[PDB]
Design a protein around this ligand. Structure first.
Ligand SMILES: N[C@@H](Cc1c[nH]c2ccccc12)C(=O)O
Ligand SMILES: N[C@@H](Cc1c[nH]c2ccccc12)C(=O)O
Ligand SMILES: [Mg+2]
Ligand SMILES: [Mg+2]
Ligand SMILES: [Mg+2]
Ligand SMILES: [Mg+2]
Ligand SMILES: [Mg+2]
Ligand SMILES: [Mg+2]
Ligand SMILES: [Mg+2]
Ligand SMILES: [Mg+2]
Ligand SMILES: [Mg+2]
Ligand SMILES: [Mg+2]
Ligand SMILES: [Mg+2]
Ligand SMILES: [Mg+2]
Ligand SMILES: [Mg+2]
Ligand SMILES: [Mg+2]
Ligand SMILES: [Mg+2]
Ligand SMILES: [Mg+2]
Ligand SMILES: [Mg+2]
Ligand SMILES: [Mg+2]
Ligand SMILES: [Mg+2]
Ligand SMILES: [Mg+2]
Ligand SMILES: [Mg+2]
Ligand SMILES: [Mg+2]
Lengths: 20, 64, 143, 50
RNA sequence: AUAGGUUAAUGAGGCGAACCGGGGGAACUGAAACAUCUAAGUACCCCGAGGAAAAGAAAUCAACCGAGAUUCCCCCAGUAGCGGCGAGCGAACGGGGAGCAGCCCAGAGCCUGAAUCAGUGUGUGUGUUAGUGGAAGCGUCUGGAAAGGCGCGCGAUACAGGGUGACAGCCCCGUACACAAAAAUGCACAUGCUGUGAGCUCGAUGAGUAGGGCGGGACACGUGGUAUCCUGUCUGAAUAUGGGGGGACCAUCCUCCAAGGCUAAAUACUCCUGACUGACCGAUAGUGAACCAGUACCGUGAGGGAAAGGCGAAAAGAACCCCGGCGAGGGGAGUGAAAAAGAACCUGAAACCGUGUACGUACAAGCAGUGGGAGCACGCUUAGGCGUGUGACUGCGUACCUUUUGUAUAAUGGGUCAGCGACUUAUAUUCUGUAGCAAGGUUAACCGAAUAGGGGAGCCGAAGGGAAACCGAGUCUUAACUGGGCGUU
């Protein structure tokens, strides 16, 4: 199809720092 | 390409008759005055490289 | 008859392939073992290297000195000379019989046994045992 | 010594080839069902192989 | 008088795959870190040129015998040497081969345009850019179709190859072979025209150079005892009774003539033309591209960059009828060997999703199978606790990989299928097997009647010991071994 464009981000984003 | 002899070793061993290698003893190049004459005396004549190091030397001198 | 020829038995060993399955005997790891520098593409350590320890060919002292004159001296066996072609074994001549090599400028005759045809050797050196063998075969040794 | 006519004939016969004395190679000797060879060639080969 | 200005005649300019010479010139990396060193004068930028480029006619090697421009190939040899003597770098002498070629200027006199070179016109020959001729097969069987099988003929200087309804020497196109150019051209010669100098006599013989000092760079050579070459800088000769080199340096000897140039071949390369070849790929392979691909697409831009081949022998590509919205899609009909080859078209696997039938399943707890095992459905057999399918009930039973002292692990990896996806290649060296020959074995390049034959330059071995001179079945150690070390089988 024409149908062919994927610009998948970076992870997605929000949160996490999980105690250091 | 031809192997290159590990040039440093070439200048410290000589293939002997049966295929041994003979070398000069260490410990006889300086700080001598404090060493027994007996010790220094025994360090003059060349000696055969031991069985354990043969592997090394040969790999250094393919064209020995 | 061009499909009835076959090579001598045990002249064509197959030769390790490795990396092809459990049965093969050399699967997965391919006889390289587990991990370390020695596995891994382009692994290994250079010749003489024996861990960071000072290597044998460096603990021991140099003792060279190359004659350079020696490089142009040949040694001759008694077994030669018969093959010199002309009963005169000369400074070269041997050279022409391809038993010395052009660059040579010196030569001893060495009791390396067996001389028969009487021969006169000229301009060479010759050991005590060689002289004796030559002479005892009707040979002559003029300088 | 090989001649013109003997060569041009056989160029098109498939199972038959003609070679001079020097042209003898190992596969061919085995290749064909019969090797002919003139008695003249035999003497050539006799020497070539010593 | 110059600079300046107008006109004119010539030539330049830009593009282009590599090979080539020149101006500049990295870092990753290697050294198991890192400065010297390496990567490497590589990558890259730049300038320039040719069909080749460059190099070249000894101020070269040799070693007292000799060789005789340059270039390329094999040796010499991973040797001599260089080297934080680390990592690494790495010659030459001499030998075997390819190809061979030698000339001008530094000048005036006479004789003068005489050799020659290029540019050019013509001629000729020879290649090129269209072409021509080119042998010989029929019968029958199977089939939709014969080139296939079987039979019997025929051509072959032609059985290279492609095509044709399945595999064709004789159907077609060719092939071998023999021929052909009106015109334009590459290449040779032969001359015409232009430009150019030949020849003899007598001369001349490359100075801000050689060398040196300082700083760098090149030489295999890292300043080292370092010859030699190049020069940014400051200097600066001799001139044939002269000068350069022979690896510090001096003598003797030997050998060459710098400070001007030209020069063909053996050597390099393939954007492109023609022909031929492959134990090269066959559509996720092979070019990124078998296809209207540097396209569609993405990016402001530089720039990145796909997917996607096959109906049939032949379109004979489905007239006409029926349901339907003058639809989509479908069923008939018809074409065809085949329509289950219908264009979403050869083959049509697997994941995945349904319809149909047999058997099990709604009191039962877990890697889901395995050992047992009734019933049911089905075939059997003549029964005979037999084959197939299902599998109540029941014993046992925590997947795979990896990684680990150890994993059901609640530690890694995998949603599934299909296709692809990882110990290769070259050159050295050593060992084993095997083969040849044997105190010998074998050639490299190259020649080539081209896997032959030639070529033994050379390499390995037959002798070792010693740093070395040297000695030699011994030798080294020491004044010397009763000895000892390495060797002699
Ligand atoms: N939530 C994010 C983690 C995250 C935190 N900060 C971010 C910034 C940018 C991208 C991702 C992240 C994740 O799923 O991984
Ligand atoms: N660590 C904090 C805040 C936070 C959110 N996203 C983050 C990304 C990066 C660093 C910190 C954060 C939390 O998770 O509550
Ligand atoms: Mg000392
Ligand atoms: Mg592993
Ligand atoms: Mg480990
Ligand atoms: Mg290991
Ligand atoms: Mg020789
Ligand atoms: Mg490093
Ligand atoms: Mg002379
Ligand atoms: Mg024709
Ligand atoms: Mg024909
Ligand atoms: Mg001169
Ligand atoms: Mg030139
Ligand atoms: Mg493709
Ligand atoms: Mg396919
Ligand atoms: Mg189909
Ligand atoms: Mg129940
Ligand atoms: Mg349950
Ligand atoms: Mg329970
Ligand atoms: Mg653990
Ligand atoms: Mg373990
Ligand atoms: Mg367990
Ligand atoms: Mg779980
Ligand atoms: Mg897990």
């Amino acid at each position: 199809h024409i149908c062919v464009t994927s610009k998948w981000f970076n992870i997605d984003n929000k949160i996490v720092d999980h105690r250091p | 390409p031809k192997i290159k002899t590990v040039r440093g070793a070439a200048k410290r061993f000589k293939k002997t008759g049966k295929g041994g290698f003979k070398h000069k003893h260490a410990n006889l190049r300086h700080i001598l005055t404090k060493k027994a004459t007996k010790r220094k005396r025994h360090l003059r004549p060349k000696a055969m490289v031991s069985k354990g190091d043969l592997g090394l030397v040969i790999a250094c001198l393919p064209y020995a | 008859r061009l499909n009835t020829l076959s090579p001598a038995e045990g002249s064509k060993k197959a030769g390790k392939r490795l990396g092809r399955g459990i049965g093969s005997g050399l699967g997965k790891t391919g006889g390289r073992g587990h991990k370390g520098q020695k596995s891994r593409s382009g692994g290994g350590v250079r010749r003489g290297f024996e861990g960071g320890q000072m290597p044998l060919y460096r603990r021991l002292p140099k003792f060279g000195f190359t004659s350079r004159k020696a490089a142009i001296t040949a040694e001759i066996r008694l077994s030669d000379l018969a093959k010199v072609e002309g009963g005169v074994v000369d400074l070269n001549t041997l050279k022409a019989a391809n038993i010395i090599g052009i660059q040579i400028e010196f030569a001893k005759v060495i009791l390396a046994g067996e001389v028969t045809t009487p021969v006169t050797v000229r301009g060479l050196r010759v050991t005590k045992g060689a002289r004796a063998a030559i002479e005892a075969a009707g040979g002559k040794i003029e300088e | 010594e090989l001649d013109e006519n003997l060569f041009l004939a056989a160029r098109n016969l498939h199972k038959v080839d003609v070679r001079d004395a020097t042209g003898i190679d190992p596969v061919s000797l085995i290749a064909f069902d019969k090797v002919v060879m003139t008695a003249d060639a035999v003497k050539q080969v006799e020497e070539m192989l010593a």
